[PDB]
Amino acid sequence: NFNVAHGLAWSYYIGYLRLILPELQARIRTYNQHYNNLLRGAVSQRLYILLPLDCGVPDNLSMADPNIRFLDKLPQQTGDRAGIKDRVYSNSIYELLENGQRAGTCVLEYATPLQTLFAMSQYSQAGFSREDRLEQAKLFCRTLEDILADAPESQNNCRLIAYQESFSLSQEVLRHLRQ
Amino acid sequence: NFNVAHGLAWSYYIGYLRLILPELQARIRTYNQHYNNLLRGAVSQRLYILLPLDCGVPDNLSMADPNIRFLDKLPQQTGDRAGIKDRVYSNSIYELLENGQRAGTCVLEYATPLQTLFAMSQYSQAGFSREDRLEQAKLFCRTLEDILADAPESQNNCRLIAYQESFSLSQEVLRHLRQ
Ligand SMILES: Nc1nc2c(ncn2[C@@H]2O[C@@H]3CO[P@@](=O)(S)O[C@H]4C[C@H](Oc5ccncn5)C[C@@H]4CO[P@@](=O)(S)O[C@@H]2[C@@H]3O)c(=O)[nH]1
């Protein structure tokens, strides 16, 4: 079963991180210079990737924590991909609240393949148990860490936030953001 | 190694086909009614998915065959996905030429995971041989066929075009399109 998370981690790098991480600093610089509110803090460098090991991935982050609120989108990145003209890669900027006030602003999202591991564990024909899922989530993160450790597109460009669940997601992101 | 193509096929269904196939007929109907040139044929129903078993997936289809030409995009499908506000799913309409004249119009693309299998075979750290790749491409298609055969979102909504390479890609699509 090893090969499920191995494949998904390689697919996440090849099909997403290696394509968007090289251009991310320029998109954030563009946002900060031309789109960011004049009075607010600069959007932090780096893509922050949430890796819940229970593979609980809501689509709406902005509601999953009261202290994480959607602010804005980066400029879109588009390119021809496998016969799709101008396929769109979009990223969302979030404010992180601490004591009701803004403590940080960053590009934040879940690793969408963890949502796949979760769905595969639920489908009879995938032949993937809820025990397989925790082991595969750990292997997914370890494989991604190992890829990015040798990856030339990763130039201080992303931070992996792995966690297991009271737990505060905003505090967990702020701890990485403040390093 | 089985588990690489198994995972990618499940991920392609869960993360893409099960999300876009339910809404595809409505997007094509919208295109035909409101956006299609009044004088041209209706865009055919169904998403046509190219599955080259050599995993050769160019990003620009429109140049990879002189007889396949980009025409237009469908209306975009957007939704919140894993913390991405309004992630964009886009599909491209192609004309198929026969004897220099239009013989068909359809929504056409490559299965992007086959591009992943190809890249994994090229990266030393993926531990995936060019022999592994042909076997995994076949298993990817077989797994996807088996998923879609039980899939309620597939309501005569897509056609898998698997092929191995002189070979005419346009003729291969027209044969499926005319059935
Ligand atoms: N956050 C984030 N993740 C992304 C994004 N793009 C890819 N990924 C992840 O990178 C890996 C490799 O991607 P591929 O394009 S070879 O495979 C995709 C192909 C198909 O999707 C689409 C979508 C739009 N148009 C055509 N096809 C389902 C399959 C898995 O799709 P997922 O979005 S569940 O996860 C993928 C996958 O894990 C993105 O824009 N944002």
What lies within 8 Å, CB to CB, of B105 at 6+ separation is B40, B41, B42, B43, B44, B71, B93, B94, B95, B96
Flag if A115 and B15 touch (Cβ within 8 Å): yes
- φ, ψ at B150 (rounded to 5°): -115, 5
Asked if A82 and A153 sit in the same domain, the reply is yes
Q: Which amino acid is at A97?
A: L
- Distance between CA atoms of A4 and B9, rounded to whole angstroms? 10
HEC string for chain A: CHHHHHHHHHHHHHHHHHHHHHHHHHHHHHHHHHHCCCCCCCCCCCEEEEEECCCCCCCCHHHHCCCEEEEEECCCEEEEECCEEEEEECCEEEEEEECCEEEEEEEEEECHHHHHHHHHHHCHHHCCCHHHHHHHHHHHHHHHHHHHHCCCCCCCCEEEEEECCCCCHHHHHHHHHCC
- For A85, the closest of B73, B82, B83 (CB atoms) is B73
Residue A48 CB: number of other CB atoms within 10 A?
Answer: 21
Residues A161 and A78 in one domain: yes
State the resolution, in angstroms: 1.8
Q: Are strands B92-98 and B101-110 parallel, antiparallel or unpaired?
A: antiparallel
Residues near ligand 1 with C-beta < 6 Å?
A 8, 11-12, 15-16, 84, 87, 89, 109, 112-113, 116; B 11-12, 15-16, 82, 84, 89, 112-113, 115-116
Query: Which range of residues forms the domain containing residue B161?
Result: 44-179
B31 in the same domain as B60 = no
Alpha-carbon gap, residue A150 to A22, rounded angstroms: 14
* Residues A61 and A36 placed together within one structural domain of the fold: no
Contacts of A152 (CB under 8 A, 6+ apart): none
Question: If DSSP codes are grouped into helix, strand and coil, which group holds residue B140?
Answer: helix
Counting Cβ atoms within 10 Å, is residue B97 exposed (0-12), middle (13-18) or buried (19+)?
Answer: middle
Residue A156, judged by CB atoms within 10 A of its CB (0-12, 13-18, 19+), counts as exposed
Residues A15 and A55 in one domain: no
Centre a 10 Å sphere on the Cβ of residue A177 and count the other Cβ atoms it contains: 19
Alpha helix (H) ranges present in chain B? 2-12, 18-30, 61-64, 112-122, 130-149, 169-177
CA angle A157, A158, A160 (to 5 degrees): 160
Count H helices and E strands in chain B, helices first.
6, 7
- For residues B62 and B106, membership in a common domain is answered with yes
Assess B76–A contact: CB distance below 8 Å, yes or no.
yes
- What residues of chain B, 111 to 140, have a C-beta less than 8 Å from chain A? 111-113, 115-116, 119-120, 123, 125-126, 128
Q: Are residues B155 and B93 in the same domain?
A: yes
Q: For chain A, how many structural domains are there in total? A: 2
Asked if A60 and A170 count as a contact pair (C-beta separation under 8 A), the reply is: no
Query: Do A56 and A36 share a domain, yes or no?
Result: no
Chain A hits for B88, Cβ within 8 Å:
76, 88, 90
Method of structure determination:
X-ray
